[PDB]
């Protein structure tokens, strides 16, 4: 389960998760920051 | 070098029409579904020919 330690093979995999989500979530801010209705 | 430019200004311009032109054949034949997704692309088009 995503919540619990209890097993060594789950922390690496959700930290490994966390840690692609930030990346991913750093490239988006670093997007906005620099910078339907008519085809309805 | 401009007169590539203005080709490729044309040819964006022409797939305008096209995909306009792609909209009515699916509100002729398709539903709202292709009718609105011919001009969800076209958005596209619209802004290259400007930004060009």
């Known amino acids: 389960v995503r919540g619990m330690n209890t097993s060594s093979a789950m922390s690496a995999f959700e930290r490994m998760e966390e840690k692609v989500l930030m990346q991913e979530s750093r490239a988006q801010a670093l997007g906005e920051l620099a910078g339907g209705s008519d085809v309805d | ?52």
């Open chain 2, 1 to 52: 070098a401009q007169k590539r430019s203005e080709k490729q200004y044309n040819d964006a311009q022409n797939e305008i029409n096209k995909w306009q032109r792609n909209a009515q054949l699916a509100l002729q034949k398709g539903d709202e579904n292709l009718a609105r997704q011919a001009l969800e692309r076209k958005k596209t088009y619209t802004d290259t020919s400007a930004a060009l």
